[PDB]
Write a protein that binds this ligand. Structure first.
Ligand SMILES: Nc1nc2c(ncn2[C@@H]2O[C@H](COP(=O)(O)OP(=O)(O)CP(=O)(O)O)[C@@H](O)[C@H]2O)c(=O)[nH]1
Ligand SMILES: Nc1nc2c(ncn2[C@@H]2O[C@H](COP(=O)(O)OP(=O)(O)CP(=O)(O)O)[C@@H](O)[C@H]2O)c(=O)[nH]1
Ligand SMILES: CC(C)(CO)[C@@H](O)C(=O)NCCC(=O)O
Ligand SMILES: CC(C)(CO)[C@@H](O)C(=O)NCCC(=O)O
Lengths: 307, 307
């Protein structure tokens, strides 16, 4: 059976590093690593460095493609100080590590030789505000496709990829659990834009951000593991994020281990798990690279799209 | 508002021919032209020749892409007598002209300088046989996604694009209105494969043939026009195809104009129109090039994806 995909173990994948230099310190890694994440410099070298080599091979190759369409159209030569931005999507469940994966990726690419402008945007900022979610009866479906302003999202990425000087995204506050009035993240003709969220790989009856991705990753793990990671993070957060009296979820800080486990499981069951099974997982087949994690968070398997 | 798309009129589009030679005679065109189609050598020159220039620019460019992934993987050099097959999808309603568009495209590309092997496959052969459609209660939904063996279809195109020496498709008989026992269409590592059908541009919870297309066309027209074309073709066929006593639809040959119009409208209303509105039209946003036809079948407008 021929296949669009090729499967690697960590042994096979890490050979593909060739001579890519490691440009990240252990301390720098910490600044990027999320609560509960196990990524170390060795995963960076054995997993993220071949990745970064793949990507940089494909950035130049993907530029030929837009150049052919320019040539056809009898369009001028593209300013080499403004190529067409390479767009990278990163997807997966809540709690699977995908935001760290994306932050690490950004760090690695920014440190490539010619110092590319590499911006990172999460879909959080494109959530409808709570007052608007409440209007729509969606206050308990944050993360589902319909809880996002997908039109604004598509506009944002279309703007950036189509060469705009600047494009703006709104900004979400996890502390306050809402969009921040007046806050903008401004992206200015970067060379690479990484877009990370749950359903960014979705497809449908209109052109969507996934149709603009030049490359995508999906961070995968067994569902039962993800839940464990999610519950455990929730318990840990009683003394980090929920401890802040300003935090929308401050009431959780004083939950017993057992009360906390019960609350987190209920949130997993009613929100995150269904969103995962119904919307996120069905996008996995399309990702250029699936990063498969074991129960201990360690990436030991990879699936690349060769077609 | 920035846009993934650029819109042309025939004036703007035909300028993009540059010096592409016309290699098709009027007689050759006839061999390709479907009952009721108005395509002439002038549409070929003003519409299909820029198209063919776009495509050939993108074939070489799209090869860089697969080469980068080979390089990354430390794969050998690709035999230049066997590149990775460029896959082209052609979609649209029944009766809109898309099969002629595809046959013409094949003729034009086969006549490019180095004489590329250019195969053409329609999704007809991947319809479930009638006995199997009946089992599924689908004898009146031929053309809807579920009336096709989509797994076999995906396998076929995956086989070809992944470099197989040969791949086989079953063969449908319009005369008999069923799959022909024992018949195979054999495709042998072509340089380009054109795949044409109603829903070939569809997307979903699994990797599908649209995810393998390097380029796609959608042949568009106003729904009311398509219906007129469909009814008129049905009336014309009383003296061509339905006239054959072997034809599954021979009974239609003896319909009055008015009986025929009533039968065709009913088939349009209950089968083709719903399939168009529900399944085919929602794929239009993704096509690389939409060919928009006026009431007289003439292509006067085009929409290209630049992103
Ligand atoms: N305080 C806070 N920050 C969050 C939360 N969710 C995501 N973040 C932001 O994203 C980072 C998480 O890194 P990582 O563990 O890779 O995130 P993830 O696996 O995508 C977890 P989730 O998808 O649940 O956010 C956090 O360090 C923080 O910057 C949250 O619930 N609370
Ligand atoms: N005899 C016959 N041939 C058909 C039929 N439908 C498609 N074909 C094949 O496809 C060709 C049609 O050319 P074209 O007019 O572009 O097809 P189309 O617009 O896709 C029409 P449809 O989609 O309804 O087949 C025919 O000449 C024939 O080879 C049909 O109902 N009867
Ligand atoms: C469970 C964690 C810590 C992991 O992301 C986080 O999703 C969380 O608990 N956030 C606040 C609770 C909530 O998700 O509503
Ligand atoms: C209406 C035409 C002639 C146009 O394709 C053709 O679709 C047709 O009439 N075929 C046989 C009738 C049927 O579609 O069942």
């Amino acid at each position: 059976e021929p296949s669009p995909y090729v499967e690697f173990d960590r042994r096979q994948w890490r050979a593909l590093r060739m001579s890519t230099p490691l440009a990240l310190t252990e301390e720098e890694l910490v600044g990027l690593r999320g609560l509960g994440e196990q990524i170390d410099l060795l995963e960076v070298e054995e997993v993220y460095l071949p990745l970064a080599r793949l990507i940089h091979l494909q950035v130049a190759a993907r530029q030929r493609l837009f150049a052919a369409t320019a040539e056809f159209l009898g369009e001028p030569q593209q300013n080499p100080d403004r190529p067409v931005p390479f767009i990278i999507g990163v997807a997966g469940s809540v709690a699977v590590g995908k935001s760290t994966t994306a932050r690490v990726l950004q760090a690695l690419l920014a440190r490539w030789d010619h110092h590319p402008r590499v911006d990172l945007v999460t879909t959080d900022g494109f959530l409808y505000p709570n007052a608007e979610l409440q209007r729509r009866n969606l206050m308990h479906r944050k993360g589902f496709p319909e809880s996002y302003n997908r039109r604004a999202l598509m506009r944002f990425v279309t703007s950036v990829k189509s060469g705009s000087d600047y494009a703006c995204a709104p900004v979400y506050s996890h502390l306050h659990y809402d969009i921040i009035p007046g806050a903008e993240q401004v992206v200015r003709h970067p060379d690479i834009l990484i877009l990370e969220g749950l359903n960014v790989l979705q497809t449908g009856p209109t052109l969507m951000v996934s149709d603009l991705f030049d490359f995508s990753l999906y961070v995968d793990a067994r569902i039962e593991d993800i839940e464990q990671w999610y519950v455990s993070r929730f318990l840990a957060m009683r003394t980090t994020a929920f401890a802040d009296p300003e935090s929308h979820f401050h009431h959780y800080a004083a939950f017993s281990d057992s009360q906390a486990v019960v609350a987190a499981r209920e949130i997993w069951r009613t929100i995150n798990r269904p969103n995962l099974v119904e919307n996120i997982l069905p996008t996995r087949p399309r990702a250029t690279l699936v990063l498969r994690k074991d129960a201990d968070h360690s990436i030991n398997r990879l699936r690349l799209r060769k077609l």
